[PDB]
Design a protein around this nucleic acid. Structure first.
Ligand code: DGT
Ligand code: CA
Ligand code: CA
Ligand code: CA
Ligand code: CA
Length: 342
DNA sequence: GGGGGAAGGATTCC
DNA sequence: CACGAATCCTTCCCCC
């Protein structure tokens, strides 16, 4: 069958910051996203393991991080930089297999089925790849290897950080019955709970439930997905993913429902969005708002043609107005998203 | 009954 | 509650 090798870069953003300023190694490093509402308002994008040991991780408020680690190194997120480093590493991987799926800024899958035979050679190829990336970009990564993408990923999670692991056909059979359903990619907290209310704590448990009831609880796609995995039949092909949308969203100094007060933020979002679009022309635009109670509302429109900067501006305000008149809540974050590229 | 789209929301965290 | 992008779901709507 198919042999998949998954690469996931270790504590990536923070590690890139270490590569660019080596003295940082050994010290707790936290990459922050400062919202500008107040001094250290915002959240953590990621932290290195020195910092994670004490509970400082992605998603917690920067303020909470500083209470725990007042003397750690706090850096503003520099996405562009991390993206360029990522691209280079992806190019190196692209040399080990043409069948590659760049799943995100820091992970990719390679179909090495006709590149090696048996897991042994696969394992050796993983070490070659780890060594090559460490040598070329001084970045440590974790390799996951199995028969399909979901398990290759799971193997990497199990080997984090700077590890490599193979989950052979026998171990998969074991995991299908031993693994906590919540540790399965695609199963967030909302799905974990529904599956719990169904008596489904492991993958195998999805086989002892009437499909119709499963489908009714979590949806058909997710249901067929889990059953497929449980039947040891999951086998999605590794394929090139293409960017389908580009957008920007900013946090406003203060929460507001005032149009003239919100426009500047919206227009700044549009400007960045367009620059990032580069030479892409979208036919669809969506105005996205995050309300005072962290809920997310959006309004959009598809055009029978490409959207120009002027159009985007004009339309953005109409969609923003539609949002204000339709949701009595104050707006905290405002932005845009362009999709359906020509 | 059913295709095809579009819109807005749900969920994931890749 | 203290920060970008993909996929899937429900609800409409138009119409063969
Ligand atoms: N802004 C923001 N960025 C995130 C968040 N989560 C992840 N990222 C970014 C920065 C992370 O370094 C990068 C890769 O995510 P990972 O889940 O693989 O974590 P990282 O690679 O940081 O740690 P790891 O060694 O894989 O456990 O994506 C988040 O919650 N907010
Ligand atoms: Ca990673
Ligand atoms: Ca990752
Ligand atoms: Ca989970
Ligand atoms: Ca994550």
């Amino acid at each position: 069958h198919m042999i998949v090798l998954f690469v996931d870069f270790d504590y990536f953003y923070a590690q890139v910051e270490e590569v660019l300023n080596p003295s940082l190694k050994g010290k707790p490093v936290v990459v922050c996203v400062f919202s500008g509402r107040f001094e250290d308002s915002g959240a953590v994008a990621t932290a290195n393991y020195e910092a994670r040991k004490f509970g400082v991780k992605a998603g917690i408020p920067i303020v909470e991080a500083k209470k725990i680690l007042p003397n750690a190194v706090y850096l503003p997120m520099r996405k562009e930089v991390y993206q360029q480093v990522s691209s280079r590493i992806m190019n190196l991987l692209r040399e080990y297999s043409e069948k590659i799926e760049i799943a995100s800024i820091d992970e990719a899958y390679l179909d090495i089925s006709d590149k090696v035979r048996d897991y042994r050679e696969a394992y050796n190829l993983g070490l070659e790849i780890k060594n090559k990336i460490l040598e070329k970009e001084k970045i440590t990564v974790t390799v996951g290897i199995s028969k399909n993408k979901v398990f290759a990923k799971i193997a990497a999670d199990m080997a984090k950080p700077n590890g490599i692991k193979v989950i052979d056909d026998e171990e998969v059979k074991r995991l299908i019955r031993e693994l906590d359903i919540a540790d399965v990619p695609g199963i967030g907290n909302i799905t974990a709970e529904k599956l719990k209310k169904l008596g489904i704590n492991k993958l195998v448990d999805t086989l002892s439930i009437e499909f119709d009831k499963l489908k009714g609880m979590i949806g058909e796609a997710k249901a067929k997905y889990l059953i497929s995995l449980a039947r040891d039949e999951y086998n999605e092909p590794i394929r090139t993913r293409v960017r389908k949308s580009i957008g920007r969203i900013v946090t406003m100094k203060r929460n507001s429902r005032n149009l003239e007060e919100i426009k500047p933020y919206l227009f700044r979002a549009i400007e960045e969005s367009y620059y990032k679009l580069d030479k892409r022309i979208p036919k669809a635009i969506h105005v996205v708002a995050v309300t005072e109670d962290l809920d997310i509302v959006s309004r959009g429109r598809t055009f029978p043609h490409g959207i120009s900067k002027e159009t985007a501006y004009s339309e953005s305000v109409k969609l923003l107005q539609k949002i204000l008149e339709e949701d009595e809540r104050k707006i905290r974050r405002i932005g845009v998203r362009f999709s359906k590229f020509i």
